[PDB]
Design a protein around this ligand. Structure first.
Ligand SMILES: *[C@@H]1O[C@H](CO[C@@H]2O[C@@H](C)[C@@H](O)[C@@H](O)[C@@H]2O)[C@@H](O[C@@H]2O[C@H](CO)[C@@H](O[C@@H]3O[C@H](CO[C@H]4O[C@H](CO)[C@@H](O)[C@H](O)[C@@H]4O[C@@H]4O[C@H](CO)[C@@H](O[C@@H]5O[C@H](CO)[C@H](O)[C@H](O)[C@H]5O)[C@H](O)[C@H]4NC(C)=O)[C@@H](O)[C@H](O[C@H]4O[C@H](CO)[C@@H](O)[C@H](O)[C@@H]4O[C@@H]4O[C@H](CO)[C@@H](O[C@@H]5O[C@H](CO)[C@H](O)[C@H](O)[C@H]5O)[C@H](O)[C@H]4NC(C)=O)[C@@H]3O)[C@H](O)[C@H]2NC(C)=O)[C@H](O)[C@H]1NC(C)=O
Ligand SMILES: *[C@@H]1O[C@H](CO[C@@H]2O[C@@H](C)[C@@H](O)[C@@H](O)[C@@H]2O)[C@@H](O[C@@H]2O[C@H](CO)[C@@H](O[C@@H]3O[C@H](CO[C@H]4O[C@H](CO)[C@@H](O)[C@H](O)[C@@H]4O[C@@H]4O[C@H](CO)[C@@H](O[C@@H]5O[C@H](CO)[C@H](O)[C@H](O)[C@H]5O)[C@H](O)[C@H]4NC(C)=O)[C@@H](O)[C@H](O[C@H]4O[C@H](CO)[C@@H](O)[C@H](O)[C@@H]4O[C@@H]4O[C@H](CO)[C@@H](O[C@@H]5O[C@H](CO)[C@H](O)[C@H](O)[C@H]5O)[C@H](O)[C@H]4NC(C)=O)[C@@H]3O)[C@H](O)[C@H]2NC(C)=O)[C@H](O)[C@H]1NC(C)=O
Ligand SMILES: *[C@@H]1O[C@H](CO[C@@H]2O[C@@H](C)[C@@H](O)[C@@H](O)[C@@H]2O)[C@@H](O[C@@H]2O[C@H](CO)[C@@H](O[C@@H]3O[C@H](CO[C@H]4O[C@H](CO)[C@@H](O)[C@H](O)[C@@H]4O[C@@H]4O[C@H](CO)[C@@H](O[C@@H]5O[C@H](CO)[C@H](O)[C@H](O)[C@H]5O)[C@H](O)[C@H]4NC(C)=O)[C@@H](O)[C@H](O[C@H]4O[C@H](CO)[C@@H](O)[C@H](O)[C@@H]4O[C@@H]4O[C@H](CO)[C@@H](O[C@@H]5O[C@H](CO)[C@H](O)[C@H](O)[C@H]5O)[C@H](O)[C@H]4NC(C)=O)[C@@H]3O)[C@H](O)[C@H]2NC(C)=O)[C@H](O)[C@H]1NC(C)=O
Ligand SMILES: *[C@@H]1O[C@H](CO)[C@@H](O[C@@H]2O[C@H](CO)[C@@H](O[C@@H]3O[C@H](CO[C@H]4O[C@H](CO)[C@@H](O)[C@H](O)[C@@H]4O[C@@H]4O[C@H](CO)[C@@H](O[C@@H]5O[C@H](CO)[C@H](O)[C@H](O)[C@H]5O)[C@H](O)[C@H]4NC(C)=O)[C@@H](O)[C@H](O[C@H]4O[C@H](CO)[C@@H](O)[C@H](O)[C@@H]4O[C@@H]4O[C@H](CO)[C@@H](O[C@@H]5O[C@H](CO)[C@H](O)[C@H](O)[C@H]5O)[C@H](O)[C@H]4NC(C)=O)[C@@H]3O)[C@H](O)[C@H]2NC(C)=O)[C@H](O)[C@H]1NC(C)=O
Ligand SMILES: *[C@@H]1O[C@H](CO[C@@H]2O[C@@H](C)[C@@H](O)[C@@H](O)[C@@H]2O)[C@@H](O[C@@H]2O[C@H](CO)[C@@H](O[C@@H]3O[C@H](CO)[C@@H](O)[C@H](O)[C@@H]3O)[C@H](O)[C@H]2NC(C)=O)[C@H](O)[C@H]1NC(C)=O
Ligand SMILES: *[C@@H]1O[C@H](CO[C@@H]2O[C@@H](C)[C@@H](O)[C@@H](O)[C@@H]2O)[C@@H](O[C@@H]2O[C@H](CO)[C@@H](O[C@@H]3O[C@H](CO)[C@@H](O)[C@H](O)[C@@H]3O)[C@H](O)[C@H]2NC(C)=O)[C@H](O)[C@H]1NC(C)=O
Ligand code: NAG
Ligand code: NAG
Ligand code: NAG
Ligand code: NAG
Ligand code: CA
Ligand code: CA
Lengths: 546, 546
């Protein structure tokens, strides 16, 4: 046919006006618009491709930032300071395109006035799920509808970490939210969200004039007052109502940030630093705006180290196994699956594993040189290594599931007999293996079956005492004295057996004699008298010289 | 330009002729060849697209199968039976396109005849890696260069399970190797491997005639004789040199397999079944060909349940928490990675978790209903559940890394020994606590001065003895039979304090006679002696009868 049998945008923008099916006037279409001048934000615009492959126009992203306690900068580079306590809406939608979508910021319900214990909580609602990021004295935690871990992904919503920031993103909508504990940033694409947002972050129109509107939809010159009207009522608390310039603030104007003076306007941050320093001196509150300026510069592909120059008073506090770096990868290379990924170009600050080692896997913190397995207890393991974890036999081997554990089945030789009286069979904690639980011939002294063996007065000590046996043996109660003197043999027993017996054995010490000194010196001898005749051996006679 | 400003193949499978730059002579080309009637395999050819998107030809995949001990069928539907005991090569490349690519079957080296646990062993060598798949009585094991786990993936080589088969594949080349313990299968694409393969599986030439070739490279008629010369050399074992047709084989021609009689040639398997039955009756060796026939039918998207009609003698044996299904998904759904639907749409046989439950994750075996966490000890866990795994406080919460564990931080008995002499601090692990040695007082009888109170006499027992303290309390060695007596108050000491006395001591107790049984008896008296008298009670005058 003279007109083409679809005269068409046939391919690769090869457009056409067909004279006939065979002979047509084909056309080719291409173009290139110059880089847009600016976006009332100083940030360089990006390239957005047409639906048609023919061309790409320049459009710049929507960026809202909030730092310090009161400091806000909207999507179009308008800056203002607002103070409040009740939770406030950050960004919402004018015409609902996504169900229950919104970003909110509770600034003081957690900590009113001074936010020293907890500065803010960030609420992100997307359809079914809501995420509340809150901070405490040492490290923030997040609650999803219940607490969760950091590397979270569910229903197109992802939460993770990057440098010193907690990032909540929706890839389908391209929404990025970064929380720091001292500031927050919201990043939105232009085409998806163009002139359809409202809240304290203003309207992403590329115009600074319409950057604040009331919920009704009016325009007010006093942009600070419009922020106070963006209050979200909730069940709890329904009764919502001379300066010497510190040199630190001078760091913005120094030559260190001279590279940042291009591609990023420094007027707002310097004024915020000066105001914070004059609010009260010597509180280390003026090195919070510097962090935001450095973060924005890094986002602008300009990485700088500045904290060195701050003479301390605010640094990073992360554990020993990590070292602080001003320029580092946004996504650290975990050993588990670094694989291949688009290396982005913006190096962010933070603290990472040392140069020699590297992180193990997402959700872990142990840095290792050559990674094998990591169990629930953070201890590095090598491939083909045998270690008794818990009460089991476990092995780290290459493949899936890592650790493989099997039961212990420890056994001991069962002995029931207990020979000594003290020995009594008792199963008890196996000392070597708390799990083996081996039984043992326990020892009770009370169960001593044999009894003390009484001995004669003569013996001294059975020596059985403290034998060290399960049953304590007993020493002999008797002792060495001339016991076997006479009759019932005891220590003196010098009964007068002789007609003139002396034998006064007084336990006189002698070999065997001590035990038995028969010191008998009878004197049965008879001595004459002047008239007592026949006195030789007469009854009861003793020597008598008379 | 009148000459086309590159008359050329226009993009999008179009073409052009050019006598004008815009007014050109446009063309477009395409086709639909009839499906190749057959491919000498009985298998339907697959659609292979050209480089450019213009046309799709019908080339049939290369499939090599071998079941039982001696049976083999080449890539082109040629069948032969070969018996051998040393390792043989299945497929290798005539022109080396991939470094160190090969498949080897080790037959009989591990089990010579009457396989005790390993019928054979597969060796798949690809570049730097080699994989050895071996079997034992109940589960196969794989060694990768040392042992590895089941879900293995490294350097473009992947090893996993599917139904009852172990699958080794290289996604870059499309090579598939399936092992079962009773058979094996090799699947190769045509374009990558055409007229470049050699070995026992033959030439994937699409002609049965050229399938068998000597290692030198000749053509011979008998495939079996050539197969014997495909032997590879290793340091190990370097010295390599009445039939009643059972109804089980008759199941092949039954109406159950009627769908398989088309689209799949059933002659070879039936002949193999008959020959195996004739080899020895009643040994359950004739239900291995049925398995391969059913597997090939299932590969053709035709699932059949047949083991129910075998009247036993060969079924599956997998643990109780899994039930056998003749038609199920090749890749079972696991909660960790539900991701997208499995469009495999071929229902391989095997055994899976029951319909109520679902498998937890790859590399795991526990079937669960609502998945939470699974630690090294295979126990299901719920979200927000607190347990005492190892000696730690651990929690299962949804997110990254699953289980979060922290130290027990066990408290201790604050005691200083104890005041009992003998006590020494033990700081021991109270059975009530676990992993918690706490200070405890350890009375030591060896470490006591029990101050034995030496009693002079008559004290039958001090009675300190054993009262419940570890100190060895003291009994008193003394006893009172004759505490009194001139002889140092010795017991049984009857001596005349006065020569005229008896003081009889029988050592008796009585009432205080235990202290003084001797008491005394007065012998003295004087009576009438010779006239003239004057005896005057002559001193020493004890009772006389003068
Ligand atoms: C950081 O920080 C720091 C501090 O400061 C602070 O901060 C800042 C930021 C600001 O703010 C301020 O203001 C504050 O205060 C700073 O500092 C600086 O540094 C630098 C560097 O370093 C320097 O310069 C240099 O240095 C060197 C050494 O270093 C050292 O020292 C220093 C001082 O001086 C310091 O600072 C540092 O830190 C260091 O320290 C050290 O450390 C070590 C360790 O590591 C140690 O060691 C130790 O000890 C012992 C000994 O050694 C043992 O044995 C061992 O070893 C260990 O243990 C040491 O001791 C320490 N030291 C000290 C003293 O401290 C030096 O040496 C030099 O000297 C030089 O000069 C001369 C003349 O010319 C010559 O003769 C010589 O030879 C030399 O040379 C040189 O070299 C160097 C090095 O390289 C250089 O430096 C550098 O370089 C580079 C290259 O590339 C670049 O250029 C840069 O820029 C630079 O700087 C130089 O330059 C050269 N020179 C020539 C021309 O030659 C010197 O001294 C400075 O001085 C400083 N200052 C201060 C103030 O201090 C920083 O800067 C920061 N950073 C950042 C990042 O920012
Ligand atoms: C040997 O070894 C051992 C150790 O070892 C262990 O154990 C064993 C069994 C096994 O198991 C193994 O294995 C292991 O390892 C030992 O044990 C120990 O001991 C200790 C010492 O002894 C103790 O502590 C303490 O003790 C005391 C005494 O003792 C006793 O007991 C025990 C237990 O507990 C035993 O064991 C022993 O043997 C003894 O026994 C007894 O004894 C008693 C005394 O003699 C007797 O009694 C008698 O009789 C009658 C009654 O019956 C009468 O009446 C009187 O009483 C007496 O005469 C008994 O009979 C027996 N039994 C048997 C069975 O034998 C104790 O006493 C103590 O306790 C107490 O105190 C406390 C304080 O605090 C309290 O609380 C409590 O309650 C009590 O009190 C009273 O007491 C009494 C007496 O005893 C009673 O009665 C009786 O008891 C018994 C016990 O057994 C039984 O029950 C009977 O039935 C009943 O009747 C009451 O009841 C009570 N109550 C009240 C009223 O209060 C403490 O106990 C420990 O404990 C132990 N442990 C164990 C576990 O056992 C052993 O000893 C050895 N042995 C030998 C011989 O050596
Ligand atoms: C209580 O307390 C007590 C005290 O008290 C006392 O005593 C008593 C009995 C009573 O009498 C009371 O009265 C008095 O007071 C105590 O005990 C003690 O202990 C301590 C500690 O242990 C000791 O120390 C030691 O020493 C030594 C010397 O000496 C010794 O020896 C001798 C002979 O020679 C003898 O005689 C003595 O006795 C002694 O012995 C001893 O003993 C103990 C007790 O028993 C013992 O302990 C214990 O034991 C048990 C059983 O029974 C078990 O065995 C346990 O385990 C243990 O612990 C000891 O052992 C023993 N020893 C001996 C020798 O015998 C020295 O020598 C020593 O040193 C050593 O040892 C140590 C540990 O112990 C160590 O550490 C060191 O190093 C050393 O080493 C040694 O070396 C030696 C030489 O060579 C040896 O020997 C020999 O060896 C061989 C091989 O080579 C073989 O075995 C043979 O058999 C052997 O003999 C050894 O063995 C080694 N050892 C080791 C392990 O190493 C120490 O220093 C003391 O002495 C004691 N004392 C007594 C007398 O006894 C307790 O203990 C307490 N507790 C409770 C019971 O409660
Ligand atoms: C792998 O193994 C498979 C199983 O063996 C095999 O599948 C089929 O195998 C059959 C048996 O081998 C095979 O049958 C053919 O038989 C021919 C001899 O008899 C035929 O020719 C005489 C006249 O010479 C004729 O009287 C008689 O009736 C037969 O007619 C033939 O019928 C064929 C089947 O319909 C037909 O092939 C079909 O062509 C279709 C075209 O749209 C379509 O592609 C179908 O898919 C295809 O099957 C064939 O064209 C026709 N011939 C004529 C002239 O009537 C053999 O000659 C023939 O071998 C040739 O074909 C196979 C592929 O089929 C080639 O591999 C092989 O190299 C031969 O190449 C052929 O060469 C002849 C001579 O030059 C060509 O004849 C010309 O045809 C022109 C029109 O197309 C024109 O008339 C010219 O004047 C003729 O000279 C012929 O076209 C060439 N074919 C091709 C495609 O190369 C074959 O053995 C059957 O064809 C096989 N079908 C397929 C594709 O599966 C499979 O082929 C094997 N594959 C490979 C890679 O080897
Ligand atoms: C990203 O991609 C690579 C670097 O790889 C990146 O960082 C790794 C640590 C991993 O995280 C990766 O997942 C991640 O993508 C770089 O692109 C270019 O790579 C080649 C090496 O393949 C560099 O060498 C160049 O090319 C050849 C050598 O292959 C030679 O001509 C020269 O050696 C030449 O230098 C190349 O330099 C590098 N690109 C640059 C900087 O020119 C790069 O870091 C980055 N590229 C992107 C994202 O475009
Ligand atoms: C034997 O002794 C017991 C007391 O127990 C003993 O006391 C010393 C002799 C010790 O050396 C040990 O041998 C032993 O511990 C007498 O039992 C009782 O004694 C008391 C005190 O004398 C009597 O009380 C008296 O009773 C009299 C009247 O009988 C009164 O006149 C006194 O004023 C006083 O109340 C008590 O009655 C008595 N009871 C008994 C059991 O008789 C025991 O009498 C005595 N027997 C002998 C052999 O004399
Ligand atoms: C040794 C001595 O003197 N003993 C006397 C003896 O002299 C005396 O003769 C005798 C008779 O009285 O009695 C005796
Ligand atoms: C011989 C005799 O009768 N025995 C004596 C007697 O002589 C004496 O007078 C009296 C007084 O001491 O004691 C008696
Ligand atoms: C294509 O165009 C030529 C020139 O007009 C004409 O002669 C021919 O018939 C056309 N063919 C078709 C299919 O329109
Ligand atoms: C170029 O295109 C025009 C319009 O179709 C045609 O008239 C002319 O002949 C073409 N050839 C030349 C001169 O490039
Ligand atoms: Ca605006
Ligand atoms: Ca062939």
């Amino acid at each position: 046919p003279p007109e083409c049998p679809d005269t068409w945008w046939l391919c690769d923008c090869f457009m056409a006006t067909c004279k006939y099916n065979n002979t047509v006037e084909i056309v080719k279409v291409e173009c290139e618009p110059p880089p847009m001048p600016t976006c009332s934000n100083g940030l360089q615009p990006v390239r957005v491709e047409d639906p048609d492959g023919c061309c790409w126009h320049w459009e710049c992203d929507c960026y809202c930032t909030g730092w310090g306690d009161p400091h806000y900068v909207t999507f179009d580079g308008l800056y203002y300071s607002y103070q409040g306590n009740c939770t406030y809406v950050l960004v919402e939608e004018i015409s609902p395109s996504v169900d229950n979508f919104g970003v909110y910021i509770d600034n003081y319900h957690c900590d009113p006035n001074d936010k020293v214990s907890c500065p803010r909580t960030l609420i992100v609602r997307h359809e079914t799920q809501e995420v509340l990021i809150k901070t405490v004295h040492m490290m923030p935690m997040q609650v999803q509808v219940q607490a969760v871990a950091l590397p979270y992904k569910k229903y197109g919503l992802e939460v993770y970490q990057s440098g010193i920031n907690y990032v909540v993103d929706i890839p389908e909508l391209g929404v990025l939210v970064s929380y720091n504990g001292l500031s927050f940033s919201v990043r939105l694409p232009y085409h998806r969200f163009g002139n359809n947002t409202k809240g304290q972050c203003g309207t992403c129109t590329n115009t600074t004039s319409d950057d604040c509107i009331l919920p009704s939809g009016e325009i007010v010159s006093n942009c600070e007052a419009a922020a106070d009207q963006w209050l979200v009522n909730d069940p709890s608390k329904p009764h919502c109502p001379d300066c010497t310039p510190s040199p630190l603030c001078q760091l913005i104007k120094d030559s260190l940030f001279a590279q940042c003076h291009a591609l990023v306007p420094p007027q707002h941050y310097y004024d915020a630093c000066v105001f914070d320093s004059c609010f009260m001196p010597g509180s280390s509150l003026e090195c919070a705006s510097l962090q935001a300026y450095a973060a924005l510069c890094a986002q602008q592909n300009i990485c700088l180290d500045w904290r060195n120059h701050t003479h301390g008073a605010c640094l990073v506090e992360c554990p020993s196994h990590r070292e602080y770096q001003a320029c580092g990868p946004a996504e650290e290379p975990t050993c588990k699956s670094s694989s291949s990924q688009q290396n982005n170009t913006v190096l962010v600050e933070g603290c990472f594993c040392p140069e020699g080692t590297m992180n193990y896997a997402p959700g872990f913190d142990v840095c290792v040189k050559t990674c094998g397995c990591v169990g629930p207890d953070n201890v590095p393991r090598e491939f083909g290594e045998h270690f008794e974890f818990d009460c089991k036999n476990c092995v780290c081997l290459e493949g899936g599931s890592g650790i493989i554990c099997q039961p212990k089945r420890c056994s001991q030789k069962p002995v029931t007999h207990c020979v000594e009286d003290g020995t009594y069979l008792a199963t008890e904690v196996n000392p070597a293996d708390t799990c083996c639980n081996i039984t043992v011939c326990k020892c009770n002294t009370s169960l001593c079956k044999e009894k003390p063996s009484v001995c004669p007065l003569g013996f001294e000590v059975k020596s059985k005492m403290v034998p060290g046996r399960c049953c304590p043996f007993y020493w002999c109660e008797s002792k060495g004295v001339c016991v076997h003197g006479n009759a019932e043999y005891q220590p003196g027993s010098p009964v007068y057996s002789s007609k003139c017996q002396d034998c006064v054995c007084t336990d006189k010490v002698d070999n065997n004699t001590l035990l038995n000194v028969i010191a008998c010196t009878h004197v049965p001898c008879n001595t004459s008298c002047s008239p007592g005749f026949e006195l030789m051996e007469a009854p009861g006679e003793c020597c008598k010289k008379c």
